[PDB]
mmCIF file of C-alpha atoms in Angstrom:
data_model
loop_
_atom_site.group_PDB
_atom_site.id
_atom_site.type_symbol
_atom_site.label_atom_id
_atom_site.label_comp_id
_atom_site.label_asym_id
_atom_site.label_seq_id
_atom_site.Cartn_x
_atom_site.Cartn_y
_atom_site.Cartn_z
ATOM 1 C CA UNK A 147 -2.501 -59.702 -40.458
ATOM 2 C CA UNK A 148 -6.420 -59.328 -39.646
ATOM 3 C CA UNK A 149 -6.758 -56.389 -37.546
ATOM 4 C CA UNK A 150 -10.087 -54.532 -36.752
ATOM 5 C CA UNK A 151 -11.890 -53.161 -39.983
ATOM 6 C CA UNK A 152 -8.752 -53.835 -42.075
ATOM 7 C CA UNK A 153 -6.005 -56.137 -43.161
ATOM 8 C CA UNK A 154 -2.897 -56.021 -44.393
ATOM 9 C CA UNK A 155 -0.209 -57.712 -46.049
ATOM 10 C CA UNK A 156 2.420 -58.519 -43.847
ATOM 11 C CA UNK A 157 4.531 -60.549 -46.616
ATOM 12 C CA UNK A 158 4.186 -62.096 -49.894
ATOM 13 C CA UNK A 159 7.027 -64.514 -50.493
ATOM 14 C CA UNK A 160 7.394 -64.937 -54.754
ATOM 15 C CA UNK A 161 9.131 -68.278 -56.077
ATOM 16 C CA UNK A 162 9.164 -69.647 -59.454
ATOM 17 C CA UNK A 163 9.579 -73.688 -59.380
ATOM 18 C CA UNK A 164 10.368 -76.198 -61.812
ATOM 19 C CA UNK A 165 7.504 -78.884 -62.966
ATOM 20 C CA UNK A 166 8.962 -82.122 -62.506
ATOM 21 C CA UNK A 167 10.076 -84.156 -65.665
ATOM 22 C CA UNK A 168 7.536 -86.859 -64.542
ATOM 23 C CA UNK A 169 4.891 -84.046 -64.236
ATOM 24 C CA UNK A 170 5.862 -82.777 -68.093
ATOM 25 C CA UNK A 171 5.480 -86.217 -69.576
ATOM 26 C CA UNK A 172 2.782 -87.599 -67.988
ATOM 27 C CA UNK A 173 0.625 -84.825 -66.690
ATOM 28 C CA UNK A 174 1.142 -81.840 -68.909
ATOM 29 C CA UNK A 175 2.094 -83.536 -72.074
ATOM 30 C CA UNK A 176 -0.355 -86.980 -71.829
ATOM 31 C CA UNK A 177 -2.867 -85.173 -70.249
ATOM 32 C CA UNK A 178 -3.058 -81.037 -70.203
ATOM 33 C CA UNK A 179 -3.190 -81.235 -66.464
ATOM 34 C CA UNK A 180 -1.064 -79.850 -63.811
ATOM 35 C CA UNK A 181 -0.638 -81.013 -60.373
ATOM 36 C CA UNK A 182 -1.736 -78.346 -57.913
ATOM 37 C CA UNK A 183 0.987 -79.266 -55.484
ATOM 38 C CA UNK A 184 4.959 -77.825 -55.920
ATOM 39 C CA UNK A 185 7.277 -80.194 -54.622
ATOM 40 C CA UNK A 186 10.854 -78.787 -55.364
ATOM 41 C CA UNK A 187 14.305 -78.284 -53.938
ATOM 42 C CA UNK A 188 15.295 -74.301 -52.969
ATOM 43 C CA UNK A 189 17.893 -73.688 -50.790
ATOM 44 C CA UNK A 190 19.402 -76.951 -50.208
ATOM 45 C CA UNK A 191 15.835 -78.058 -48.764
ATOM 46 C CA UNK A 192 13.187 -79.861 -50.025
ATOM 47 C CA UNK A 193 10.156 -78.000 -49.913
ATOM 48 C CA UNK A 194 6.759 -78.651 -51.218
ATOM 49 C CA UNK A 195 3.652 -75.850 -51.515
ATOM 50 C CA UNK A 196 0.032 -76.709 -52.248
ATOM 51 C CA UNK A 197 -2.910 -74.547 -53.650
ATOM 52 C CA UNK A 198 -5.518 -73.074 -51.629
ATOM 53 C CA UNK A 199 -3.221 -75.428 -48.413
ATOM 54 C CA UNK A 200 -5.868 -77.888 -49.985
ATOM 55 C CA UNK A 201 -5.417 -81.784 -51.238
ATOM 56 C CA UNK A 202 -3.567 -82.633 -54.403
ATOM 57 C CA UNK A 203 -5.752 -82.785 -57.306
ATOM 58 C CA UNK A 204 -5.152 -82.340 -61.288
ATOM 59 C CA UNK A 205 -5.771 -79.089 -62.435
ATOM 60 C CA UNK A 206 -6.591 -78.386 -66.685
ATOM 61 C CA UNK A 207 -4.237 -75.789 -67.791
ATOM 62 C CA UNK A 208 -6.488 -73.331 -69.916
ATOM 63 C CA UNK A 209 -4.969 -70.560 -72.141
ATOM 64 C CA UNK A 210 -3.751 -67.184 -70.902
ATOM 65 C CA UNK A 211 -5.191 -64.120 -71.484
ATOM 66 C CA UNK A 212 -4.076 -62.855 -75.008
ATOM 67 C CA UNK A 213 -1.742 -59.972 -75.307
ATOM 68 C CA UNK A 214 0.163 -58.475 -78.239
ATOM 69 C CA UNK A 215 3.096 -59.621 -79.642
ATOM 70 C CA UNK A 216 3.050 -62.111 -77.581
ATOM 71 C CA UNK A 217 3.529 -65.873 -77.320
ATOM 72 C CA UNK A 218 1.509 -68.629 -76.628
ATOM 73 C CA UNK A 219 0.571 -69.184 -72.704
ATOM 74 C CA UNK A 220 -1.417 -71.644 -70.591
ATOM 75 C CA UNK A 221 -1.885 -71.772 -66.634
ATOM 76 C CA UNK A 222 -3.964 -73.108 -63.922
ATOM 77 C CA UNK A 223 -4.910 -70.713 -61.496
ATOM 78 C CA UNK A 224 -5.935 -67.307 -61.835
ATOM 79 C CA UNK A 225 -6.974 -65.841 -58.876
ATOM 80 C CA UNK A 226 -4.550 -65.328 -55.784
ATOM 81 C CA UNK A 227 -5.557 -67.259 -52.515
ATOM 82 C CA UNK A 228 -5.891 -65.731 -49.008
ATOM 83 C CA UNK A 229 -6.127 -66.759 -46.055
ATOM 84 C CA UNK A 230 -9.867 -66.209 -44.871
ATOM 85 C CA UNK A 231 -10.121 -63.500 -41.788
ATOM 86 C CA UNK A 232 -9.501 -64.450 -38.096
ATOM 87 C CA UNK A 233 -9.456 -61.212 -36.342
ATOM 88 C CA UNK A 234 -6.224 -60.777 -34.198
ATOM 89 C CA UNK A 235 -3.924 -62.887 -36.018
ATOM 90 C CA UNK A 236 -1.617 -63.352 -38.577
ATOM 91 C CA UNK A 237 -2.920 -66.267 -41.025
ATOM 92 C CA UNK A 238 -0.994 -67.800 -44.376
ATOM 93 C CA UNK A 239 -1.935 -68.684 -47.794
ATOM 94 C CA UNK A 240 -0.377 -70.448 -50.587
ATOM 95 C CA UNK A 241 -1.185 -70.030 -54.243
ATOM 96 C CA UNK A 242 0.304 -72.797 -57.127
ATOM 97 C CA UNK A 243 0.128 -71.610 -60.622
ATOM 98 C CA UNK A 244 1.397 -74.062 -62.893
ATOM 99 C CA UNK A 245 2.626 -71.488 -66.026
ATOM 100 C CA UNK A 246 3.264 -73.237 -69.536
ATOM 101 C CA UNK A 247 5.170 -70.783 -71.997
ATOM 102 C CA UNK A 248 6.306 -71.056 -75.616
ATOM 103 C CA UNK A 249 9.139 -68.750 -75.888
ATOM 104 C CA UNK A 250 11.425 -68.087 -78.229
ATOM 105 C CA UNK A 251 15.525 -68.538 -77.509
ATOM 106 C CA UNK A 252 18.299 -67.125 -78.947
ATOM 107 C CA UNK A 253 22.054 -68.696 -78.498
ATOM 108 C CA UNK A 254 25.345 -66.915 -79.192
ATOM 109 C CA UNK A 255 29.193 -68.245 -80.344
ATOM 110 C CA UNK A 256 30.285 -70.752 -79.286
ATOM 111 C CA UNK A 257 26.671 -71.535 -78.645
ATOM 112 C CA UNK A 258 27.352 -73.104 -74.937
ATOM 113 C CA UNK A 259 24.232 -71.284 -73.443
ATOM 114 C CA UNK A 260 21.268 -69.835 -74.361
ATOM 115 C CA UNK A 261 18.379 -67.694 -72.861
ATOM 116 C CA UNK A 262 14.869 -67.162 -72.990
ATOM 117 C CA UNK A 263 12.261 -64.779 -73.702
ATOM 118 C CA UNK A 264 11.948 -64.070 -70.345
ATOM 119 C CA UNK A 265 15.425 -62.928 -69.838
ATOM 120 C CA UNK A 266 16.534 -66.219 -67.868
ATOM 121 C CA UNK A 267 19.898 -67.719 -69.069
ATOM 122 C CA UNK A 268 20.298 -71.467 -69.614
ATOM 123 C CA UNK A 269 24.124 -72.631 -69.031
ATOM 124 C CA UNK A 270 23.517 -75.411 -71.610
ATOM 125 C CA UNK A 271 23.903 -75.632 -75.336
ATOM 126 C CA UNK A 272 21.456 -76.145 -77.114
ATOM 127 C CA UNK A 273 23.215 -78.797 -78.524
ATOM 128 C CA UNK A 274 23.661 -80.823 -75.676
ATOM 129 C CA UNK A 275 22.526 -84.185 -76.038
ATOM 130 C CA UNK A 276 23.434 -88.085 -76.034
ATOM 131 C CA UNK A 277 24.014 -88.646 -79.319
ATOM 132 C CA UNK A 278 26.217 -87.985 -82.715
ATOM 133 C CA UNK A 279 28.749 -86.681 -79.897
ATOM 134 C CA UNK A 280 26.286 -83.890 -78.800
ATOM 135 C CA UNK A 281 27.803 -85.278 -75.292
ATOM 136 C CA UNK A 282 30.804 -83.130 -75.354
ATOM 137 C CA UNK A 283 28.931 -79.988 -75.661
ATOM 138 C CA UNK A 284 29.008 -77.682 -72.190
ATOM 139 C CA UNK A 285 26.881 -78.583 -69.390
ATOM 140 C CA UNK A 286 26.869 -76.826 -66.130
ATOM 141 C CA UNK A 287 24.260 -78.436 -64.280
ATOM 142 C CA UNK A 288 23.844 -81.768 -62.594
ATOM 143 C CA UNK A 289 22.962 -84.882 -65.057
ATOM 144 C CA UNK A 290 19.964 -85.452 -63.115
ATOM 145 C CA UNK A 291 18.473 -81.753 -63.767
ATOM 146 C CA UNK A 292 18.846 -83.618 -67.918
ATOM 147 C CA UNK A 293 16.354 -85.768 -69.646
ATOM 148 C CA UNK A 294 16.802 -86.637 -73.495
ATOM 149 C CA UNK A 295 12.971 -88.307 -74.949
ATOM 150 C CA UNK A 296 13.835 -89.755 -78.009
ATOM 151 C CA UNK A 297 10.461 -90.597 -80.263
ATOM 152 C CA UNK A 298 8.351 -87.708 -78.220
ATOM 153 C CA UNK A 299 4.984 -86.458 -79.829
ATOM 154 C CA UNK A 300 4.152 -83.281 -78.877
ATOM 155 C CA UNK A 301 0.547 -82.395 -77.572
ATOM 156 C CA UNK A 302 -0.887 -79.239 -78.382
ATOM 157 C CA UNK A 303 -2.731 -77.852 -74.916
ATOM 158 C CA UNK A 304 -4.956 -75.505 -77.083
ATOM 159 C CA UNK A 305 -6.393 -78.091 -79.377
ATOM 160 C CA UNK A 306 -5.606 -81.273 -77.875
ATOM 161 C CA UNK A 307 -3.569 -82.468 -80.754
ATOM 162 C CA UNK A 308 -1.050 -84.918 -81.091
ATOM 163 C CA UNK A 309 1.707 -84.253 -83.358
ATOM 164 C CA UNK A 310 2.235 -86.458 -86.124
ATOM 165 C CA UNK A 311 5.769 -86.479 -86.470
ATOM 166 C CA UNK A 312 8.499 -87.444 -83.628
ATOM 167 C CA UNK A 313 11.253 -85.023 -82.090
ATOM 168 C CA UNK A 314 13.525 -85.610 -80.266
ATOM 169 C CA UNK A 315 12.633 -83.799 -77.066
ATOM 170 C CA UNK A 316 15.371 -82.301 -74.536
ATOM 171 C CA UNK A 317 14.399 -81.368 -70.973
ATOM 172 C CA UNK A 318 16.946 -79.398 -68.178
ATOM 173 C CA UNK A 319 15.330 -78.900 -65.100
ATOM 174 C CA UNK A 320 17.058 -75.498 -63.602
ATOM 175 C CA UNK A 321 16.392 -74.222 -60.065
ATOM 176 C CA UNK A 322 13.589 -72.062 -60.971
ATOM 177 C CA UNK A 323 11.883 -73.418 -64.283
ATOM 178 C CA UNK A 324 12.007 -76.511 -66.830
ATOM 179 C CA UNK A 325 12.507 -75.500 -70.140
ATOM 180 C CA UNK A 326 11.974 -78.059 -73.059
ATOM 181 C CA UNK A 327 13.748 -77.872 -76.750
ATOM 182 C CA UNK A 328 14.204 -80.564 -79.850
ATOM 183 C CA UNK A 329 17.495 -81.318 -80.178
ATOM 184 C CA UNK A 330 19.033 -80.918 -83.377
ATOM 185 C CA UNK A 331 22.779 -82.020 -84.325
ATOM 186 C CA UNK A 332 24.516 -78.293 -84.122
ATOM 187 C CA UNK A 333 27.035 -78.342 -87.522
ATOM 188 C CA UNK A 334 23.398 -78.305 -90.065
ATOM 189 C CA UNK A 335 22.396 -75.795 -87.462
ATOM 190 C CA UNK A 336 24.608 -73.132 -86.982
ATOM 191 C CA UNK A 337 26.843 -71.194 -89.381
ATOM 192 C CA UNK A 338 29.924 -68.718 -88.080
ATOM 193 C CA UNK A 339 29.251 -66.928 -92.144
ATOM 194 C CA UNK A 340 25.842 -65.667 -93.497
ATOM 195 C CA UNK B 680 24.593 -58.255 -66.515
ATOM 196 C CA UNK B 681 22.220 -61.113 -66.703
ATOM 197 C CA UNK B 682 24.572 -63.453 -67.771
ATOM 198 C CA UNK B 683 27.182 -62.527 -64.820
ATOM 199 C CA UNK B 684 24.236 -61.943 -62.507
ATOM 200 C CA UNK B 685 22.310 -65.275 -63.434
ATOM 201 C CA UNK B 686 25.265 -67.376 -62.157
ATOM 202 C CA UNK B 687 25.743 -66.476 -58.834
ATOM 203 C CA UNK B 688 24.356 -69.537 -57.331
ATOM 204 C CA UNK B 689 26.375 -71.825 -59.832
ATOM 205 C CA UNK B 690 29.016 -70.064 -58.365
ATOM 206 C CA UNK B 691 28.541 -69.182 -54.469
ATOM 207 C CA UNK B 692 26.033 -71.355 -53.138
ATOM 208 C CA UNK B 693 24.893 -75.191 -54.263
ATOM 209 C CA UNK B 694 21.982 -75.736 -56.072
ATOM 210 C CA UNK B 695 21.578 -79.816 -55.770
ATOM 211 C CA UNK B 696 22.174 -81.010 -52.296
ATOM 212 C CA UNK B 697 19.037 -81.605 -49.885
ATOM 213 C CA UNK B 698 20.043 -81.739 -46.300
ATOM 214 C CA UNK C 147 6.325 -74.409 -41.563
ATOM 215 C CA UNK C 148 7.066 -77.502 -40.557
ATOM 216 C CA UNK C 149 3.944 -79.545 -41.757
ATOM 217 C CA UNK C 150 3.070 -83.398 -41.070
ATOM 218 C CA UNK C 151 5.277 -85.305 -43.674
ATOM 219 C CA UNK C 152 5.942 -82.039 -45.859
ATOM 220 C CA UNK C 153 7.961 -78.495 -44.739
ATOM 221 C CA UNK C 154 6.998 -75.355 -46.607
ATOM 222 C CA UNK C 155 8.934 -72.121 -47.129
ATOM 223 C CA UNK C 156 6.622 -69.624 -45.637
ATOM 224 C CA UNK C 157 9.503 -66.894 -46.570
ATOM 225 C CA UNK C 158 12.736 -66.276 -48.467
ATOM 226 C CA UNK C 159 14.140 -63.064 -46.913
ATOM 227 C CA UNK C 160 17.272 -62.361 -48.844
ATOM 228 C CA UNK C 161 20.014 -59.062 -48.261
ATOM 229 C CA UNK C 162 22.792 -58.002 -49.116
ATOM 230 C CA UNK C 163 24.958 -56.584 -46.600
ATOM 231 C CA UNK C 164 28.011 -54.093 -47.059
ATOM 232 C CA UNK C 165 31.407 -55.551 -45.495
ATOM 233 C CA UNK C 166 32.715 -52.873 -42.831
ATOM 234 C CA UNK C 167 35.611 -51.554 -43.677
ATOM 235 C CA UNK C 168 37.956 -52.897 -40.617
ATOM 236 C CA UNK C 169 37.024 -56.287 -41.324
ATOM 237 C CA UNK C 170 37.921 -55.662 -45.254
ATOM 238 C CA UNK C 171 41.410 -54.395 -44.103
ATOM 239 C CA UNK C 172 42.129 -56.053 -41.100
ATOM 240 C CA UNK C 173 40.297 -59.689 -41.739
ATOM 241 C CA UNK C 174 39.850 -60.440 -45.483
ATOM 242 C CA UNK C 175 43.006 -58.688 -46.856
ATOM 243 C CA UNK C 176 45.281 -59.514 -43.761
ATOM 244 C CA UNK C 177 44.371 -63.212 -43.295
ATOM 245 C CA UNK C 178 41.585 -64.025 -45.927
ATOM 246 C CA UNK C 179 38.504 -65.081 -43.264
ATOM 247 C CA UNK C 180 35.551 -63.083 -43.304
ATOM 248 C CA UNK C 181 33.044 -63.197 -39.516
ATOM 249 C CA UNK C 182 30.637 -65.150 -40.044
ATOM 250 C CA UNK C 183 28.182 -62.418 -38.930
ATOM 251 C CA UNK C 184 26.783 -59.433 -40.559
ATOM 252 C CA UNK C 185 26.422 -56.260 -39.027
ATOM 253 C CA UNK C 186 25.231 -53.579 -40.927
ATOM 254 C CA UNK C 187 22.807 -50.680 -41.025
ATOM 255 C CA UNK C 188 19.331 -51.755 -42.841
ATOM 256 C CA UNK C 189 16.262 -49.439 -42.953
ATOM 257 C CA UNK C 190 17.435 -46.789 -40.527
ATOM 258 C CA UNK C 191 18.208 -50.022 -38.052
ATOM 259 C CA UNK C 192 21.621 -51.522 -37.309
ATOM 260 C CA UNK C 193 20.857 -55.128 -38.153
ATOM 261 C CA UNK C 194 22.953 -58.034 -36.854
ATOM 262 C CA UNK C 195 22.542 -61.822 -38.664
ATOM 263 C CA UNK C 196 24.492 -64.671 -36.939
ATOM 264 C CA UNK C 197 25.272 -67.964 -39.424
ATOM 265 C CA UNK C 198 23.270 -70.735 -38.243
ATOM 266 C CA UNK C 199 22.245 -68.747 -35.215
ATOM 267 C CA UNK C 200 25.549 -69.416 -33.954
ATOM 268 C CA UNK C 201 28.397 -67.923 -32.120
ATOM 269 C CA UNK C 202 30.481 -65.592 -34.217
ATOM 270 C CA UNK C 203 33.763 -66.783 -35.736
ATOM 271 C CA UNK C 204 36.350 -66.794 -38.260
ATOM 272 C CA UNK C 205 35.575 -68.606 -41.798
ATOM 273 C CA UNK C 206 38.652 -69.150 -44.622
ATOM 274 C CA UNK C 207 37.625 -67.464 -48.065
ATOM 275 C CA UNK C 208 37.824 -70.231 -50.772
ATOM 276 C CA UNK C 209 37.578 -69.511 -54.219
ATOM 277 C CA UNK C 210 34.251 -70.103 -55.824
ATOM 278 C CA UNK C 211 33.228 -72.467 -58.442
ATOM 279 C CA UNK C 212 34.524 -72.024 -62.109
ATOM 280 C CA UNK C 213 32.395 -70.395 -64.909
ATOM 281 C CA UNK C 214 33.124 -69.299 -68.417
ATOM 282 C CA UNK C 215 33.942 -66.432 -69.230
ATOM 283 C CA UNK C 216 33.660 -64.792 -65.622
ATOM 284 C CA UNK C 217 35.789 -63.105 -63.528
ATOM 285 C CA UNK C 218 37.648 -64.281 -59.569
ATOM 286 C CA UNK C 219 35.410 -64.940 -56.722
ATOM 287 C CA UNK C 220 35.466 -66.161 -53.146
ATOM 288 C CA UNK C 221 32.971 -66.977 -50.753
ATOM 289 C CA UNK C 222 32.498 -68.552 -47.427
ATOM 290 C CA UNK C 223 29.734 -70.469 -47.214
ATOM 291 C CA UNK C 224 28.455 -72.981 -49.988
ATOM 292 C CA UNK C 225 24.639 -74.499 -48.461
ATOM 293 C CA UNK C 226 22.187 -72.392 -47.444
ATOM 294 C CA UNK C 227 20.906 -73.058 -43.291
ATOM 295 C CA UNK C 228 17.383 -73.817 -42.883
ATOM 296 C CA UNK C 229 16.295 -74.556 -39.514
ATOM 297 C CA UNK C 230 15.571 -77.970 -37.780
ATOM 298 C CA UNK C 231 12.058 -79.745 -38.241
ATOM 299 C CA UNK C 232 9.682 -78.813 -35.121
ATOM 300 C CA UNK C 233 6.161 -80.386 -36.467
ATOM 301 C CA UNK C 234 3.816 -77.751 -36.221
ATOM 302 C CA UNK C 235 5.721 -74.989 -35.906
ATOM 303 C CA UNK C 236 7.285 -71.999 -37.758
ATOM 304 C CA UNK C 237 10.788 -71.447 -37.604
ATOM 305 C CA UNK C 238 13.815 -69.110 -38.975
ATOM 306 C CA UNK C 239 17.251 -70.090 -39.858
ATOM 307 C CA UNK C 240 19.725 -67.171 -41.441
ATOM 308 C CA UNK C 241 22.594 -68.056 -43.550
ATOM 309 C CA UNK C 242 25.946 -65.727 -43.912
ATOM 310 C CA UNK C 243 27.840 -66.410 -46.892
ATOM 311 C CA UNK D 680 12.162 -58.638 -71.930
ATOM 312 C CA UNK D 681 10.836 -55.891 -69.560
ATOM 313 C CA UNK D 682 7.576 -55.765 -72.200
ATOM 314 C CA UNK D 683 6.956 -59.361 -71.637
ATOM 315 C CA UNK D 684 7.465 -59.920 -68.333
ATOM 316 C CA UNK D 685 5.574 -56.938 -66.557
ATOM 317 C CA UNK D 686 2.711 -58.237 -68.863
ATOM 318 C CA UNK D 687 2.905 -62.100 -66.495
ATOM 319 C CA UNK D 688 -0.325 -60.719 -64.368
ATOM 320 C CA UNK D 689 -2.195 -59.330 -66.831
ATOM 321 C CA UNK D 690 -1.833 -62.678 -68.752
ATOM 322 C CA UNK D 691 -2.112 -65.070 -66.275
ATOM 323 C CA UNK D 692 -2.907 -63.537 -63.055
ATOM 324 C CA UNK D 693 -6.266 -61.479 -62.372
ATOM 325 C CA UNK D 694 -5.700 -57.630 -61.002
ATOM 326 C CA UNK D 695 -9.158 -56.452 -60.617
ATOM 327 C CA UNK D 696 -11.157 -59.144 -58.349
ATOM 328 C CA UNK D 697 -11.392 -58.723 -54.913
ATOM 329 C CA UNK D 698 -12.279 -61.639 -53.465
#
């Protein structure tokens, strides 16, 4: 709200929404780019958010500021937008970050979830796949919110390096992030005796 | 907590259908 | 906001609203329905939300979806109401589940 | 995970600028 010789925050809505699998393969992965639109599904509606209310364009994800003990971060946007002042009126602005995080994840017995470094639970093993019978292995979201790239090189968004060696790369889409992991067969993985 | 917490929508509301 | 060929969620607000304690004994534990409206003190205000800005009436409690390791739930309501596309307009839409 | 994730704007957010 712009009122005379001040203004003031009448909201700030906060969502966190999941890049595309499209958008990790060919934008973020070929390219170290980001779309700055978000085009996702909350609340049984299709909704879709773009920076500065501007154009689509392709935005180069540069690294985060450092911190300690801390892993690796890149992202797009650092400053917030506003709307510019109109006196006597109540104005909105929309700000797109797109945030890429290596974090670190840690599964339990019987190892049919995991979570994240950032607290959020994934109700997938981290087994879950398409092949050696990594099929069976618990699933509770939609097969559509699962991708499985078999022969995927990795691109490093720091120095712009292409791995030299294949993974096999798993993607789950969740509601509010896409989180990426190679899949490897569970039994050579995971031991019930130390 | 998180755990319970973290699937209330998986278990309440529906996350895939677009009306 | 509904945009040209794109809607936006300008805002999310999202409550959670004590059941009153005649509709506990008399509606969920007598028959198993809960009103589909919420009426309940918020912020020093008595607030009152309407599902789909409708009428008020009786919903059936069905059980909720499985999970592991989790314990018995019900609820009423399983999508979320957004309101109906008005180009160039801002609009509100509650949901009471 | 409170450490890491009250540190999201000073990693990749900006607290001082005023535009």
């Amino acid at each position: 709200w712009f009122g005379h010789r001040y203004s003031q925050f009448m909201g700030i809505f906060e969502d966190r929404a999941p890049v595309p699998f499209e958008e990790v393969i060919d934008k973020i992965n070929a390219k170290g780019v980001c779309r700055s639109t978000a085009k996702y599904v909350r609340n049984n509606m299709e909704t879709t958010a773009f920076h500065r209310d501007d154009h689509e364009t392709d935005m180069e994800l540069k690294p985060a500021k450092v911190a300690t003990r801390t892993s690796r971060g890149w992202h797009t946007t650092d400053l917030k937008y506003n709307p510019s002042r109109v006196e006597a009126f109540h104005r909105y602005g929309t700000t797109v970050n797109c945030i890429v995080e290596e974090v670190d994840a840690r599964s339990v017995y019987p190892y049919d979830e995991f979570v994240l470094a950032t607290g959020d639970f994934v109700y997938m093993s981290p087994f879950y796949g398409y092949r050696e019978g990594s099929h069976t292995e618990h699933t509770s979201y939609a097969a559509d919110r699962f991708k499985q790239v078999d022969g995927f090189y990795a691109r490093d968004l720091t120095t712009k390096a292409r791995a030299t060696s294949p993974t096999t790369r798993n993607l789950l889409t969740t509601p509010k992030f896409t989180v990426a992991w190679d899949w490897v067969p569970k039994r050579p993985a995971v031991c019930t005796m130390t | 907590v998180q755990r319970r917490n973290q699937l209330h929508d998986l278990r309440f509301a529906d996350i895939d259908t677009v009306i």
